Coordinates of N, CA and C and ligand atoms in Angstrom, one line a residue:
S1 N -97.3 11.6 -147.9 CA -97.5 11.0 -146.3 C -98.4 10.1 -146.2
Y2 N -97.1 8.8 -146.2 CA -97.7 8.2 -146.9 C -97.0 6.9 -145.7
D3 N -96.7 6.9 -144.5 CA -96.8 5.8 -143.1 C -98.1 5.4 -142.4
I4 N -98.4 3.9 -143.2 CA -98.9 2.7 -142.7 C -99.2 3.2 -141.4
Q5 N -98.3 3.3 -140.6 CA -98.6 2.6 -139.2 C -98.9 4.0 -138.4
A6 N -98.9 5.3 -138.7 CA -99.4 6.4 -138.0 C -101.1 7.0 -137.6
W7 N -101.1 6.0 -137.9 CA -103.1 5.8 -137.9 C -103.8 5.7 -135.9
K8 N -102.6 4.6 -135.6 CA -102.2 4.7 -134.1 C -102.1 5.3 -133.3
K9 N -101.7 6.5 -133.8 CA -101.2 6.9 -132.0 C -101.9 8.5 -132.7
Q10 N -102.6 8.4 -133.5 CA -103.6 9.5 -134.2 C -104.7 9.0 -133.4
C11 N -105.1 7.7 -134.0 CA -106.4 7.0 -132.9 C -105.9 7.6 -131.1
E12 N -105.0 7.0 -131.1 CA -104.2 6.7 -129.5 C -105.1 8.6 -128.4
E13 N -104.3 9.7 -129.3 CA -104.7 11.3 -129.4 C -106.6 11.5 -129.5
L14 N -107.1 11.6 -130.9 CA -108.5 11.2 -131.0 C -109.3 10.5 -129.6
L15 N -108.9 9.3 -128.8 CA -109.5 8.9 -127.7 C -109.4 9.9 -126.3
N16 N -108.0 10.1 -126.7 CA -107.2 11.1 -124.8 C -108.6 12.8 -125.4
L17 N -108.6 12.5 -126.6 CA -109.6 14.1 -126.8 C -111.2 13.4 -126.5
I18 N -111.2 12.6 -126.6 CA -112.9 11.8 -126.4 C -112.9 12.1 -125.2
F19 N -112.0 11.7 -124.0 CA -112.3 11.0 -123.0 C -111.7 12.6 -122.5
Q20 N -112.0 13.6 -122.7 CA -111.7 15.0 -122.4 C -113.2 15.9 -121.9
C21 N -113.5 15.4 -123.3 CA -115.3 15.8 -123.4 C -116.3 15.5 -122.7
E22 N -117.1 16.3 -121.8 CA -118.0 16.2 -120.9 C -118.6 14.8 -121.2
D23 N -118.8 15.1 -122.7 CA -120.1 14.5 -124.0 C -119.9 13.2 -123.8
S24 N -118.9 12.3 -123.2 CA -118.0 11.2 -123.4 C -118.9 10.4 -122.0
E25 N -119.1 11.4 -120.5 CA -118.9 10.1 -119.6 C -119.8 9.2 -120.3
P26 N -121.5 9.4 -120.5 CA -122.2 7.8 -120.9 C -121.6 6.9 -121.2
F27 N -120.0 7.2 -121.7 CA -120.1 6.0 -122.9 C -118.1 5.6 -122.5
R28 N -117.8 5.8 -121.4 CA -116.4 5.9 -120.7 C -116.1 4.1 -121.2
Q29 N -117.4 3.8 -120.1 CA -117.2 2.0 -119.1 C -118.1 1.4 -119.7
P30 N -118.4 0.3 -119.7 CA -119.8 -0.9 -120.1 C -120.9 -0.4 -119.2
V31 N -121.7 -0.7 -119.9 CA -122.7 -0.1 -118.8 C -123.0 -1.1 -118.2
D32 N -123.9 -1.2 -117.2 CA -124.6 -1.6 -116.3 C -125.8 -1.9 -115.8
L33 N -126.1 -3.4 -115.8 CA -127.8 -4.2 -116.1 C -128.3 -3.9 -114.9
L34 N -127.6 -3.2 -113.7 CA -128.5 -3.6 -112.4 C -129.3 -2.2 -112.5
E35 N -128.6 -0.9 -112.7 CA -129.5 0.2 -113.1 C -130.3 0.6 -114.9
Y36 N -129.6 -0.8 -116.2 CA -130.5 -0.6 -117.1 C -131.1 -2.0 -116.9
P37 N -131.9 -2.9 -116.1 CA -132.1 -4.6 -116.4 C -132.1 -5.0 -117.7
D38 N -132.5 -4.0 -118.7 CA -133.5 -4.6 -119.6 C -132.2 -4.3 -120.7
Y39 N -131.3 -3.7 -120.4 CA -130.7 -3.6 -121.6 C -129.7 -4.1 -122.6
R40 N -129.4 -5.7 -122.3 CA -129.6 -7.5 -122.9 C -130.1 -6.8 -124.0
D41 N -131.6 -6.7 -123.5 CA -132.8 -7.2 -124.5 C -133.0 -6.8 -125.8
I42 N -132.0 -5.3 -125.6 CA -132.5 -4.3 -127.0 C -130.6 -4.2 -127.9
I43 N -130.1 -4.6 -126.9 CA -128.6 -4.0 -127.2 C -127.4 -5.4 -128.1
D44 N -127.5 -5.8 -128.6 CA -127.0 -7.6 -129.3 C -125.6 -7.3 -128.2
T45 N -124.5 -6.4 -129.0 CA -123.3 -6.1 -129.1 C -122.9 -4.7 -128.4
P46 N -122.7 -4.8 -127.0 CA -122.4 -3.6 -125.5 C -121.0 -3.0 -126.9
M47 N -120.4 -1.8 -126.5 CA -119.7 -1.2 -126.5 C -119.2 -0.2 -125.7
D48 N -117.8 1.2 -125.7 CA -117.6 2.4 -124.9 C -116.2 2.3 -124.9
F49 N -116.0 3.7 -124.9 CA -114.7 4.0 -124.7 C -113.0 3.4 -124.7
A50 N -113.4 2.7 -123.3 CA -112.5 2.1 -122.9 C -112.2 1.0 -123.3
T51 N -113.1 -0.3 -123.8 CA -113.2 -1.3 -124.2 C -112.4 -0.9 -126.0
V52 N -112.7 0.3 -126.5 CA -111.6 0.6 -127.7 C -110.3 0.7 -127.4
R53 N -109.8 1.6 -126.8 CA -108.2 2.3 -126.1 C -107.8 1.1 -125.8
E54 N -108.3 0.3 -125.4 CA -107.8 -1.6 -124.5 C -107.7 -2.3 -125.3
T55 N -108.3 -2.5 -127.2 CA -108.0 -3.2 -128.2 C -107.2 -2.8 -129.1
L56 N -107.3 -1.3 -129.3 CA -106.0 -0.3 -129.7 C -104.5 -0.7 -129.2
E57 N -104.7 -0.8 -127.9 CA -103.4 -0.7 -127.1 C -103.2 -2.4 -127.4
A58 N -103.9 -3.2 -126.7 CA -104.1 -4.9 -127.4 C -102.8 -4.9 -128.1
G59 N -103.5 -4.3 -129.2 CA -102.7 -4.0 -130.7 C -103.5 -5.1 -132.0
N60 N -104.8 -5.1 -131.2 CA -105.8 -6.4 -131.7 C -106.3 -5.3 -132.8
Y61 N -106.4 -4.4 -133.5 CA -107.3 -3.2 -134.9 C -106.2 -3.5 -135.6
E62 N -106.5 -4.3 -136.8 CA -105.0 -3.9 -137.8 C -105.0 -2.8 -138.4
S63 N -106.4 -2.0 -138.2 CA -106.7 -1.1 -139.2 C -106.9 0.6 -138.8
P64 N -108.0 1.5 -139.4 CA -108.4 2.6 -138.3 C -109.8 2.3 -138.7
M65 N -110.2 1.2 -140.3 CA -111.4 1.5 -140.3 C -112.3 0.3 -139.0
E66 N -111.4 -0.5 -138.0 CA -112.2 -1.5 -137.9 C -112.2 -0.6 -137.0
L67 N -111.4 0.6 -136.3 CA -111.5 0.9 -134.8 C -113.1 2.0 -134.9
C68 N -112.8 1.9 -136.3 CA -113.9 3.3 -136.3 C -115.7 2.4 -136.7
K69 N -115.1 1.3 -137.1 CA -116.5 0.3 -136.8 C -117.0 0.2 -135.7
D70 N -116.0 0.4 -134.5 CA -116.7 -0.3 -133.2 C -116.6 1.1 -132.4
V71 N -116.2 2.6 -132.6 CA -116.5 4.2 -131.7 C -118.1 4.4 -133.1
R72 N -118.6 3.7 -134.2 CA -120.0 4.0 -134.5 C -120.9 2.7 -134.1
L73 N -120.0 1.6 -133.1 CA -121.5 1.2 -132.7 C -121.6 1.8 -131.4
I74 N -120.9 2.8 -130.8 CA -121.3 3.5 -129.4 C -121.8 4.1 -129.5
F75 N -123.0 4.4 -130.7 CA -124.0 6.2 -131.2 C -124.8 4.6 -131.7
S76 N -124.7 3.9 -132.1 CA -126.1 3.5 -132.8 C -126.8 2.6 -131.7
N77 N -126.3 2.1 -130.5 CA -126.3 1.7 -129.3 C -127.3 2.6 -129.0
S78 N -126.8 3.8 -128.6 CA -126.9 4.5 -128.0 C -128.6 4.9 -128.4
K79 N -128.7 5.2 -129.6 CA -129.6 5.7 -130.6 C -131.0 4.3 -130.8
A80 N -130.7 3.6 -130.2 CA -131.2 2.1 -130.4 C -131.5 2.1 -128.4
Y81 N -131.1 2.0 -127.8 CA -131.8 2.4 -126.5 C -131.9 2.8 -125.9
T82 N -132.6 4.4 -126.1 CA -133.3 5.7 -126.0 C -134.7 5.7 -126.0
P83 N -135.3 6.5 -125.4 CA -137.2 5.7 -125.5 C -136.9 6.8 -126.2
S84 N -136.1 8.4 -126.3 CA -136.7 9.6 -127.0 C -135.2 10.4 -128.1
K85 N -135.7 10.4 -129.1 CA -134.7 11.4 -129.6 C -133.9 13.0 -128.5
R86 N -134.9 12.8 -127.7 CA -134.2 14.2 -126.9 C -134.0 13.9 -125.5
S87 N -133.5 12.2 -125.4 CA -133.1 12.0 -123.9 C -131.6 13.2 -124.1
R88 N -130.8 13.1 -122.6 CA -130.0 13.8 -122.2 C -129.0 12.7 -123.1
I89 N -128.7 11.6 -122.9 CA -127.7 11.1 -123.3 C -127.2 10.5 -124.7
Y90 N -128.4 10.4 -125.5 CA -128.4 10.8 -126.5 C -128.1 11.1 -127.4
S91 N -128.3 13.0 -126.5 CA -127.6 14.2 -127.2 C -126.6 14.3 -127.1
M92 N -126.1 13.8 -126.1 CA -124.6 14.1 -125.3 C -123.6 13.0 -127.0
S93 N -124.9 11.8 -126.7 CA -123.8 10.7 -128.3 C -123.3 11.9 -129.6
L94 N -125.4 12.1 -129.5 CA -125.1 13.5 -131.2 C -123.6 14.6 -131.3
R95 N -123.3 14.9 -130.2 CA -122.6 15.6 -130.3 C -121.0 15.1 -130.6
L96 N -120.9 13.9 -129.2 CA -119.9 13.6 -129.5 C -119.3 12.5 -131.2
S97 N -120.6 12.1 -131.6 CA -120.2 11.9 -133.0 C -120.1 12.8 -134.0
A98 N -120.7 13.6 -134.3 CA -120.0 15.1 -134.9 C -118.3 15.0 -134.6
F99 N -118.0 14.9 -133.6 CA -116.9 15.5 -133.1 C -115.5 14.2 -133.2
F100 N -116.4 13.1 -133.9 CA -115.8 12.0 -133.8 C -114.8 12.3 -134.9
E101 N -117.0 11.9 -135.8 CA -116.6 11.9 -137.6 C -115.8 12.8 -137.7
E102 N -115.7 14.2 -137.4 CA -114.5 15.5 -137.7 C -113.8 14.7 -138.0
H103 N -112.7 14.7 -137.0 CA -111.4 14.2 -136.6 C -110.7 13.1 -137.1
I104 N -111.6 11.9 -137.0 CA -111.2 10.7 -138.0 C -111.9 10.1 -139.5
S105 N -112.3 11.7 -140.2 CA -111.7 11.6 -142.1 C -110.7 12.0 -142.4
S106 N -109.6 12.3 -141.2 CA -108.3 12.5 -142.3 C -107.3 11.0 -142.0
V107 N -107.3 10.8 -140.3 CA -106.3 9.5 -139.6 C -107.5 8.5 -141.1
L108 N -108.3 8.0 -141.7 CA -109.0 7.1 -142.6 C -108.5 7.6 -143.7
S109 N -108.7 8.6 -144.4 CA -107.6 8.9 -145.1 C -106.6 9.0 -145.7
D110 N -105.7 8.9 -144.5 CA -104.3 9.3 -144.8 C -104.2 7.7 -144.6
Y111 N -104.4 6.7 -144.0 CA -104.0 5.1 -143.9 C -104.3 4.2 -145.5
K112 N -105.6 5.1 -146.1 CA -106.2 4.2 -147.0 C -104.7 5.0 -148.5
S113 N -104.3 6.5 -148.4 CA -103.5 6.5 -149.4 C -101.9 5.9 -149.0
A114 N -101.4 5.7 -148.0 CA -100.4 5.3 -147.5 C -100.5 3.6 -148.5
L115 N -101.5 3.2 -148.3 CA -102.0 1.9 -148.4 C -101.3 1.7 -150.0
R116 N -102.1 2.5 -150.1 CA -103.0 2.9 -152.1 C -101.2 3.3 -152.2
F117 N -100.2 3.4 -151.7 CA -98.9 4.4 -152.2 C -98.4 2.7 -152.0
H118 N -98.3 2.1 -151.4 CA -97.7 0.4 -150.6 C -97.8 -0.1 -152.3
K119 N -98.3 -0.2 -152.1 CA -99.1 -1.1 -153.3 C -98.9 -0.4 -155.1
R120 N -99.1 0.2 -155.0 CA -98.4 1.8 -156.3 C -97.7 0.9 -157.3
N121 N -96.9 -0.1 -157.2 CA -95.8 -1.5 -158.4 C -95.9 -2.4 -157.7
Ligands
LIG1 O1 -124.8 3.1 -117.9 C1 -124.0 4.5 -118.8 N1 -122.9 5.1 -119.2 C2 -121.9 3.9 -118.4 C3 -122.9 5.0 -117.3 C4 -121.0 5.1 -115.6 C5 -121.2 6.2 -115.1 C6 -121.5 6.7 -116.5 O2 -121.7 6.4 -117.4 N2 -125.2 4.6 -119.9 C7 -124.1 5.5 -121.5 C8 -125.2 4.3 -122.3 N3 -126.9 4.5 -122.4 C9 -128.0 5.5 -123.6 O3 -126.8 6.0 -124.5 C10 -129.3 5.7 -123.0 C11 -129.3 5.9 -122.0 C12 -130.2 7.1 -122.0 C13 -131.1 7.0 -123.4 S1 -129.8 6.7 -124.4 C14 -127.8 3.6 -121.0 C15 -126.9 4.2 -120.2

């Protein structure tokens, strides 16, 4: 299964699944500083799933590893901003992270395999 390009549509489909998850609700658009006035005191690099989807559709990711780094940033930002490990939005982030990691592991594997096949000679 050595298609170097196949990761892109696989990531589009996984983002569609994440947008259907009720657990993505807090993470679907950049945080609003009116409601969370100190957010940018704590978080140096905001990230959200609409930004990830737009970057993918612009042709601004070279690899699924770069997409994976931005999606992991969504979850690290929620862990850094939460006042409690028992918070509602942090708890949603942990379930969504588990779902994402379960689905991205074949996308990464297949891509890295396809690039090794391309370099085989
Ligand atoms: O404002 C947003 N998200 C956009 C809105 C738009 C309507 C739904 O979501 N967020 C999500 C990320 N935050 C967190 O991870 C945490 C808050 C408390 C503990 S962690 C901050 C609040």
